């Protein structure tokens, strides 16, 4: 009979790489949220020169995890250190397997005693639920799914609804919706503030601003509130096609690779995970090609989570952490895109006679699957790095890049990242026919600043 | 107090063009269907090499029309000529007011006696329950507005799913659907097919348009995906879907000519204020203190073959006074493709104060009525750009517009693309500087025409 779990999907899919990078499974798409409100320009604008309402209500997984054990379970499976956690403090939650490659990553909430929530893309979430079912914890967990990405016009509830408050003026319509002074706590700290007579919880998601979450049902109030308090200061929501871009001037990479595709001791969760999860069902794309779906996975030190990461607790992949020279670890890094060699790959789309133009590259997020790795190469052809998040910042008039890169590479460094997939392109449905290109990319800061060549 | 018709509006709203290409109503969205299932490239590309399936539910205005004198509201209000006109035969309705200026157009479904259905936007929607209920008709209205641009995850119901099924494999689709042969109705016609046991109307367009009762969407939709598969059949998203037109010609977008005159006085005491044409907006490079010269008539924008002098209609005595042979015509403008590479170069200029408008794939519009001046080589406006985006099956930017009737096909003229002092206050326009584009006159339908070259550019 058909599979059940992804076990029995890759003993029957031949290659592993192969398989999921020709996945039938189409775009990732961030879902619900109308894509613009203006336009993707200026919301990406009012971001840094005014302030934004995000909408994160309907893109991430949320999973509540209560019960005497639900810290044990934390704890046994976070790089990050549990000590000293009280509740009001999240963290940037961050498993590995026993091999010591980075599983995924979300945003943990210490709701209160015993009570917490995760927030992030499905791996992390898969990774926990499989815990805490099989690992025998007394802990009760809540699964709370993204949002359909092609709802149909059907109807779409969530536990929560989720916003942020960013940009320089973002501490000012703060202040004036809760209606007194409001201490910037540090970042990552919790506490709270008034929307409309509403206690409304947050978060020092910091120019300050804050991430704020309530009960679905006030999500209208609380939206209406904040909008018309922000119109004194310019304030716009943003749609689902610039939200995503955010990431690329702040640097965090939301798509590793799940590294659980091989490894004895990964067999029983490759047992437990169906057959129609994120891992089984998603795709890979971009230029970066191996017939090992271990060269794809990523360990936290490559990815910039080496700072959280600390031997002072028991937890999974502790020993290979410990074997890992950070020193000589790859490193996160922006790329800054060449601007004429962008201009080269739109202009192809406007090439009546050519055989072929190169890979379209959407704005301003132009990534064709849920997990991106285009191969980041030197001057004499090596590959030394794995581009893996990638789009176009208004604010900035250029391309960019999330990238791993070889430790030694000095900022400045011009590089070339190959852009768009071989032999006219893989078979996802993302993909149009196709030829590569090399773009030239100047290695730079994370966040991303300005860099000089040289 | 809010106003509560488009006449007061416009009696506090300062210059009428001014109002309209200031307005904060935000882009014209093609709203509720997925923005893609695959890609729009391969999605445009399937429409004219496999099979596709169009998703029309959501977009368009529905006005059924009933009762005993259906038929004369529209024989009195339409240029076309009713004669003929029966059950089962669809036609592109077009409403002209009394100066003869297109208010808008749509199809028109005579569905049985007595019995009839607008599609299409707002305007002649408007237009047609405005006479309904001030001009002495026995008719019944039922109007089904198109879905809400953002409707924010809340549920959204029509009274009919509405799709196409187009492209050189269609017919082997829809006969597979069928279960045998089904006759190609004639052009307009209306007929039926079977869909997973239900009997599904038709309407010829070489595919075909099919609707039935919203509740049978998805069982319609499943049985066509399923069936189409054998023939590379996808689905289209609502990026690629509205960039049709440009290979297909119809434009979309006239403005309803109705703001000014004082035998439209009482329509504009009528029209909600909240109306398409209270808050709608317009877009581009073509301006003018006076909102008539955004007006078109039948003739400019390819329905002169429609006009009839065989029955009374509203606007007959001013379209007789017109010369056909005078009117600006509808052609496909081809945008030159350096010039295209170029409108894209600039925003990835760091150093420039200012680029060019951004041009959306692979649809281009940034307002629900679009007015881009045509040049000649001297400068002088000859012509009105009116539709604008890309074709991935011609590896082309096209624009519909309607130009000077001497003008001759494959003559270059200019686009003047984006609008003037750094861009209006319209929510969906970023600043930018202008730049005059490089256009082909081309046949409408599309068609690749090579440029004729003249003594220093066509100018007159
Ligand atoms: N609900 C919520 N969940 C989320 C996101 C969010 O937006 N909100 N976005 C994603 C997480 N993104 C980041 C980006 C940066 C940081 C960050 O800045 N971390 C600190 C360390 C945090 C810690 O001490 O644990 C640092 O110094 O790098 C954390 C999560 C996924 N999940
Ligand atoms: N439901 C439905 N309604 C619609 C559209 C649709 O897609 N389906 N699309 C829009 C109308 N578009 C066209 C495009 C071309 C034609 C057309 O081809 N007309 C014939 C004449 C038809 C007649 O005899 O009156 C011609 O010769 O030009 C008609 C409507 C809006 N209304």
Redesign the interface.
Same mark, same amino acid.
């Given at each position: 009979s058909a599979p059940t779990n992804l076990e029995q999907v890759l003993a029957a899919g031949g290659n592993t790489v192969e398989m999921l990078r020709n996945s039938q499974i189409?775009?990732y798409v961030y879902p619900?949220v109308?894509?613009? /409100? *203006?336009?993707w320009?200026?919301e990406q604008?009012a971001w840094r020169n005014s302030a934004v309402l995000f909408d994160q209500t =309907?893109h991430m997984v949320d999973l509540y995890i209560r019960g005497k054990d639900a810290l044990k379970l934390l704890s046994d499976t976070m790089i990050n250190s549990p000590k000293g956690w009280e509740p009001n403090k999240a963290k940037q939650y961050v498993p590995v397997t026993p091999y010591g490659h980075v599983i995924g990553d979300g945003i943990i909430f210490y709701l209160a005693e015993e009570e917490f929530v995760y927030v992030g893309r499905a791996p992390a979430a898969n990774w926990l639920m499989y815990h805490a079912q099989t690992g025998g914890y007394n802990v009760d967990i809540v699964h709370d799914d993204r949002?359909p *990405?092609?709802? $149909?016009? +059907?109807?779409?509830?969530r536990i929560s609804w989720r916003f942020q408050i960013q940009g320089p003026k973002a501490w000012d319509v703060i202040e004036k919706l809760h209606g007194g002074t409001l201490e910037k706590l540090k970042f990552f700290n919790m506490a709270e503030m008034n929307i409309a007579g509403m206690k409304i919880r947050t978060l020092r998601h910091g120019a300050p601003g804050l991430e704020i979450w309530g009960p679905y049902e006030t999500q209208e109030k609380a939206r209406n509130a904040i909008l018309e308090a922000g119109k004194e200061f310019g304030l716009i929501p943003v749609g689902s096609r610039a939200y995503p871009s955010n990431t690329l001037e702040s640097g965090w990479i939301p798509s590793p690779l799940p590294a659980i595709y091989t490894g004895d001791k990964l067999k029983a969760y490759r047992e437990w995970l169906p057959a129609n999860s994120y891992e089984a069902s998603g795709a890979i794309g971009g230029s970066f090609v191996s017939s090992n779906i271990e060269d794809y996975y990523v360990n936290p030190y490559e990815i910039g989570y080496g700072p959280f990461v600390k031997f002072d607790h028991d937890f999974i992949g502790r020993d290979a952490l410990e074997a890992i020279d950070p020193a000589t670890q790859r490193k996160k890094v922006t790329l800054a895109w060449n601007? #004429?060699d $962008?201009?080269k790959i739109?202009?192809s789309? /406007? #090439?009546?006679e050519a055989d072929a =133009?190169y890979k /379209?590259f959407d704005?301003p997020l132009a990534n064709?699957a849920n997990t991106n790795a285009d191969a980041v190469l030197d001057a004499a052809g090596n590959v030394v790095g794995m581009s893996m998040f990638t789009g176009?910042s208004?604010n &900035? +008039?250029?391309?960019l890049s999330l990238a791993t890169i070889d430790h030694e590479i000095p900022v400045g460094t011009e590089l070339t990242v190959l852009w768009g997939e071989e032999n006219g392109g893989t078979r996802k449905?993302?993909? &149009?026919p196709h030829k590569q290109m090399a773009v030239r990319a100047v290695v730079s800061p994370v966040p991303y600043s300005v860099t000089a060549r040289e």
């Open positions: 189409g775009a619900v109308a894509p613009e /409100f *203006s336009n320009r200026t604008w =309907h949002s *990405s092609r709802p $149909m016009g +059907k109807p779409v509830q601007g #004429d $962008m201009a739109y202009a789309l /406007f #090439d009546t =133009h /379209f704005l064709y176009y208004y &900035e +008039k250029r391309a449905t993302t993909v &149009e």
